[PDB]
Design a protein around this ligand. Sequence first.
Ligand SMILES: *[C@@H]1O[C@H](CO)[C@@H](O)[C@H](O)[C@H]1NC(C)=O
Ligand SMILES: *[C@@H]1O[C@H](CO)[C@@H](O)[C@H](O)[C@H]1NC(C)=O
Ligand SMILES: *[C@@H]1O[C@H](CO)[C@@H](O)[C@H](O)[C@H]1NC(C)=O
Ligand SMILES: *[C@@H]1O[C@H](CO)[C@@H](O)[C@H](O)[C@H]1NC(C)=O
Ligand SMILES: *[C@@H]1O[C@H](CO)[C@@H](O)[C@H](O)[C@H]1NC(C)=O
Ligand SMILES: *[C@@H]1O[C@H](CO)[C@@H](O)[C@H](O)[C@H]1NC(C)=O
Ligand SMILES: *[C@@H]1O[C@H](CO)[C@@H](O)[C@H](O)[C@H]1NC(C)=O
Ligand SMILES: *[C@@H]1O[C@H](CO)[C@@H](O)[C@H](O)[C@H]1NC(C)=O
Ligand SMILES: *[C@@H]1O[C@H](CO)[C@@H](O)[C@H](O)[C@H]1NC(C)=O
Ligand SMILES: *[C@@H]1O[C@H](CO)[C@@H](O)[C@H](O)[C@H]1NC(C)=O
Lengths: 209, 225, 344
Amino acid sequence: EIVLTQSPATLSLSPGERATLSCRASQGGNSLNWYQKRRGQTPRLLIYDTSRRASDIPEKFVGSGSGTDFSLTITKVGPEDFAVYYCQQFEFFGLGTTLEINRTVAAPSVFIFPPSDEQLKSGTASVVCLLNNFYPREAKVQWKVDNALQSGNSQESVTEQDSKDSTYSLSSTLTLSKADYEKHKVYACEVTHQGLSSPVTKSFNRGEC
Amino acid sequence: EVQLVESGPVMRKPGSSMKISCATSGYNFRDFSIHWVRFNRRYGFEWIGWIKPMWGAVNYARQLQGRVSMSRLFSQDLYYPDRGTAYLEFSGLTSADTADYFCVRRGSSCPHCGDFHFEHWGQGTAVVVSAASTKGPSVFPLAPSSKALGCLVKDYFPEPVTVSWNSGALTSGVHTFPAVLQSSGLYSLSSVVTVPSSSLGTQTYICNVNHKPSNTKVDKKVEPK
Amino acid sequence: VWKDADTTLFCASDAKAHETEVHNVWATHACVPTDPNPQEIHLENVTENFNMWKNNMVEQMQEDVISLWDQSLQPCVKLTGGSVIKQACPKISFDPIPIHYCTPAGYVILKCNDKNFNGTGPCKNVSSVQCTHGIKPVVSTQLLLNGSLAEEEIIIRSENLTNNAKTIIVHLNKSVEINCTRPSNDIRKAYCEINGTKWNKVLKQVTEKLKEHFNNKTIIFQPPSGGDLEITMHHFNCRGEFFYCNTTQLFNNTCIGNMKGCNGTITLPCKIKQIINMWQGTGQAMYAPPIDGKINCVSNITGILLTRDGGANNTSNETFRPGGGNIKDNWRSELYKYKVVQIE
Ligand SMILES: *[C@@H]1O[C@H](CO)[C@@H](O)[C@H](O)[C@H]1NC(C)=O
Ligand SMILES: *[C@@H]1O[C@H](CO)[C@@H](O)[C@H](O)[C@H]1NC(C)=O
Ligand SMILES: *[C@@H]1O[C@H](CO)[C@@H](O)[C@H](O)[C@H]1NC(C)=O
Ligand SMILES: *[C@@H]1O[C@H](CO)[C@@H](O)[C@H](O)[C@H]1NC(C)=O
Ligand SMILES: *[C@@H]1O[C@H](CO)[C@@H](O)[C@H](O)[C@H]1NC(C)=O
Ligand SMILES: *[C@@H]1O[C@H](CO)[C@@H](O)[C@H](O)[C@H]1NC(C)=O
Ligand SMILES: *[C@@H]1O[C@H](CO)[C@@H](O)[C@H](O)[C@H]1NC(C)=O
Ligand SMILES: *[C@@H]1O[C@H](CO)[C@@H](O)[C@H](O)[C@H]1NC(C)=O
Ligand SMILES: *[C@@H]1O[C@H](CO)[C@@H](O)[C@H](O)[C@H]1NC(C)=O
Ligand SMILES: *[C@@H]1O[C@H](CO)[C@@H](O)[C@H](O)[C@H]1NC(C)=O
């Protein structure tokens, strides 16, 4: 079979920059295809047979390559050209590459939300922490229950790129039983990030306003 | 133009089977092979197989032998012939068979180009497989601190859930996160909205969570304390 | 000096005016008599590039054999998409004759004389002729009948071997007879006798010759994954009757060489159908019941049509299943070594 590597995965393209990826296929001697896929929508073919544009496609999409390595090129990236990109060789497919809008600063802001009383009457508690923006995506959201660092009992929800301001957002939800929640008092969220001079902690005490 | 249209969303218990159709139009059904591709969520793409509707000849992927069968059917009408639907049968469903399934066809353009240049994609068919059952969500408030506000949509199945505020009057500053699959087999997501801290005693905020599979609609009002 | 070009060819044969047979009647009105003194000019110091997969000669022959079959073979009933066409269906005399294809003035057919020529590469020994050799328009699936053999060794033909959507043509350097019979007394039930000792001997070589093109790994045959009976079985026509034979035994990979006791005569379960799917791509056709007496069609197997079953072959074996389906590929089996060029 044939291996297809799409390294690297993502890069920050300022509106107007040029893209250059690498489809270092295992066994050359063949061609390659390219697909633009805005997630939630269907893939759109762009370049077929190593280097050829498909029907009704703007000439900003440029493809080339030979042997094992291949290259795609976009001239002046548009607002709807930020998506995923995949290459193929016959029955064997690639993994994909993501495009992202740049700048953006470096600092995350942090809201905290205690579980509602209505939910406690069901036997479970959900502590939701809210982050806006925060690039780079390397986060270190640490949960602290009475200064006891928590791990393995929370889950995260990240990307939702807005075309208006190129901002991010992120949720990490802590799930505990009704019992364990009332067992402790202080609940904090430790957001350690590179664009933060010092780790920001937002907290609340159980039962208070 | 050439279009490919597939059947609606599908959820199946593990061990079950599914038959997905794929209506075609805008070209001659006989002249082109139809391949089936599933957009493997966070796995990329895995090619399933093709069918040449001349004799219904098929070639199934080796890593799917004994679980997949394909067939075709030509147009019944005498006034609108040359069309036709293609079909995909999938048996013995488990966990890894949760994906978005597409019917594709090689774009009509060149001769030398091999039979794997998919220019035409169907709208797709989302397919979920678990032991969970259709359930309507509860809606708890993420109340604003007295020192943003939102709604968390928890314990529902299956996808999706759409989120709008005040019947679609407040759209700016709204952040509806993607759903997360809990260990319980049921989904959950979070939706928040940043608003002025002065309008927390004069403005009413309401989140319209919608869940069509369970035919559920909740009107929730988020307030401080 | 010449140039690769395409033009309208004309057919030539030895068809006889008194013959009531289907192919003779067509060739009478459609062809000219065979030239009694064919000449071949060997071009020295001249190489040339061929491609049997892009050959307009193929698309012309296809257009003619369709005409032949539309003129004579007429079903009692036939769908026209949403309606039916009820025509005339008398029993006919059916036995395909050799049909030469020839070039007009200003043009010449170039012939590849390289023995181990696979169909796509360049040739070293090229000659010029005016007409192709005698080619019977035998339509069939899975197996190629009454055709030409390979010059030296078994030759594997394919547009792209790494492409599973490309049908494979196995050109046999040694042919094996297939004796098909419908005895005269359940009147639909026929059979095909084949010398088993000679078949798996040839199929042994086919397996070995195929291992060269796939990194020396094991090679196993499997029954077709699906489709219409015409493609899942050995479909063909003898004496105007449509035969369908089960070829499961023909690919008994267990009995290939090894464990050693698999000799003798093998017979294939066959049936004669009156309701078929037209290879014309025109739909379904209903024919009249068979004719009385012993129907017998002793044919030669000259080639096999395979499609590589391909996916994520993590294991060390390629799976090959029989089945052509594309009758244009039947013509390429004979027209592979010819190319039409325009002179100056
Ligand atoms: C082999 O397949 C490639 C597509 O990957 C195609 O471009 C090429 O023409 C094929 N080779 C030959 C000799 O036709
Ligand atoms: C036929 O020979 C040519 C030239 O040597 C080569 O490029 C091609 O791969 C061969 N094809 C097959 C099917 O062996
Ligand atoms: C030259 O052509 C003859 C007849 O056409 C053929 O048999 C022979 O193999 C060719 N010679 C060489 C050296 O290939
Ligand atoms: C069958 O094959 C033999 C050689 O094995 C040949 O002499 C005969 O002409 C063939 N019959 C045809 C082509 O109809
Ligand atoms: C047919 O070709 C094979 C090699 O492909 C060779 O071993 C065998 O001897 C040939 N058969 C005859 C009868 O020449
Ligand atoms: C073919 O087989 C039939 C019996 O099925 C027999 O009568 C006939 O003589 C055989 N012909 C040849 C050429 O072996
Ligand atoms: C099969 O053919 C072989 C020659 O390869 C011959 O010796 C043998 O007698 C044939 N078998 C039968 C049953 O006629
Ligand atoms: C052919 O025969 C085999 C075994 O005898 C059987 O498994 C297969 O289904 C048959 N094919 C048909 C009836 O199309
Ligand atoms: C394969 O060959 C073996 C050995 O003679 C035989 O027992 C078996 O029936 C064959 N399989 C078939 C004919 O499907
Ligand atoms: C093969 O040729 C023989 C005569 O050479 C003929 O009787 C037989 O019908 C032919 N086979 C087919 C399938 O037409």
